[PDB]
Design an enzyme around this catalytic site. Structure first.
Site, PDB file in Angstrom:
ATOM      1  N   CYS A   7      -0.911  -3.915   3.533  1.00  0.00           N
ATOM      2  CA  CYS A   7       0.061  -2.841   3.538  1.00  0.00           C
ATOM      3  C   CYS A   7      -0.240  -1.859   2.397  1.00  0.00           C
ATOM      4  CB  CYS A   7       1.511  -3.290   3.539  1.00  0.00           C
ATOM      5  SG  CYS A   7       2.084  -4.212   2.077  1.00  0.00           S
ATOM      6  N   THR A   8       0.716  -0.968   2.120  1.00  0.00           N
ATOM      7  CA  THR A   8       0.429   0.031   1.130  1.00  0.00           C
ATOM      8  C   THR A   8       0.344  -0.453  -0.316  1.00  0.00           C
ATOM      9  OG1 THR A   8       1.450   1.783   2.480  1.00  0.00           O
ATOM     10  CG2 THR A   8       1.144   2.233   0.143  1.00  0.00           C
ATOM     11  N   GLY A   9       1.393  -1.085  -0.795  1.00  0.00           N
ATOM     12  CA  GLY A   9       1.435  -1.698  -2.090  1.00  0.00           C
ATOM     13  C   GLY A   9       1.557  -3.218  -2.230  1.00  0.00           C
ATOM     14  N   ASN A  10       1.540  -3.939  -1.116  1.00  0.00           N
ATOM     15  CA  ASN A  10       1.618  -5.395  -1.138  1.00  0.00           C
ATOM     16  C   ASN A  10       2.920  -5.929  -1.709  1.00  0.00           C
ATOM     17  OD1 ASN A  10       0.051  -8.210  -2.564  1.00  0.00           O
ATOM     18  ND2 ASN A  10       0.385  -7.926  -0.443  1.00  0.00           N
ATOM     19  N   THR A  11       3.986  -5.192  -1.493  1.00  0.00           N
ATOM     20  CA  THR A  11       5.306  -5.612  -1.891  1.00  0.00           C
ATOM     21  C   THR A  11       6.330  -5.917  -0.784  1.00  0.00           C
ATOM     22  OG1 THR A  11       6.207  -3.404  -2.016  1.00  0.00           O
ATOM     23  CG2 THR A  11       5.163  -4.235  -3.900  1.00  0.00           C
ATOM     24  N   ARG A  13       5.694  -5.276   3.600  1.00  0.00           N
ATOM     25  CA  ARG A  13       5.255  -5.745   4.899  1.00  0.00           C
ATOM     26  C   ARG A  13       4.234  -6.860   4.887  1.00  0.00           C
ATOM     27  NH1 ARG A  13       3.940   0.248   7.080  1.00  0.00           N
ATOM     28  NH2 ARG A  13       3.581   0.378   4.845  1.00  0.00           N
ATOM     29  N   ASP A 118       6.959   1.581   7.853  1.00  0.00           N
ATOM     30  CA  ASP A 118       7.284   1.298   6.490  1.00  0.00           C
ATOM     31  C   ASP A 118       8.786   1.175   6.245  1.00  0.00           C
ATOM     32  OD1 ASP A 118       7.129   1.093   3.757  1.00  0.00           O
ATOM     33  OD2 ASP A 118       6.325   2.990   3.431  1.00  0.00           O
TER      34      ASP A 118
END
Length: 150
Positions: A7-11, A13, A118
């Site tokens: 995902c975008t920041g691994n926080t 999804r 998101d």
């Protein structure tokens, strides 16, 4: 097999996918190694509180440490599943030697292009809906991966 969700920041999804999938695979008797990372992640952090809370409702603990995508991860992976097509392209731009391992979760599972949207900054219910959608895809994925001899 070794698979990574991105995902975008691994926080949000991908960590959710990582936890949900490990649990599903265990129930299915699928032996697999599961990780997650972000295209723009800090290694700084943990999963978002909503992401944790959403899994908690399902009796799954999401004790996570965020990580950016690395060569170590990309190299070792058999399969890399991006949440969105843009994630997939970004990954390919940075890890061109490994493009062939990278698909969106939805295209790999369903055969059609799609994104897992998101939820960052959304309500708990947005996160719950995101969890449910991942869970549905992941149950299908577990069945598919079991047919992979890797």
């Amino acid at each position: 097999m070794d698979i990574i969700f991105v995902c975008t920041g691994n926080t949000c999804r991908s960590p959710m996918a990582e936890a949900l999938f490990k649990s599903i695979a265990e129930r299915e008797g699928l032996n697999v190694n599961v990780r997650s990372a972000g295209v723009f992640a800090s290694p700084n952090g943990k999963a978002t509180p909503h992401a944790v809370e959403a899994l908690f409702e399902k009796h799954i603990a999401l004790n996570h440490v965020s990580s950016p995508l690395t060569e170590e991860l990309m190299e070792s992976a058999d399969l890399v599943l991006a949440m969105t097509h843009q994630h997939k392209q970004i990954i390919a731009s940075q890890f061109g030697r490994y493009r062939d391992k990278v698909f969106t979760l939805k295209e790999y599972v369903t055969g059609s292009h799609g994104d897992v949207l998101d939820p960052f900054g959304g309500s708990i219910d947005i996160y719950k809906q995101t969890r449910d959608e991942l869970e549905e895809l992941l149950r299908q994925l577990a069945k598919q991966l079991k047919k992979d001899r890797r």
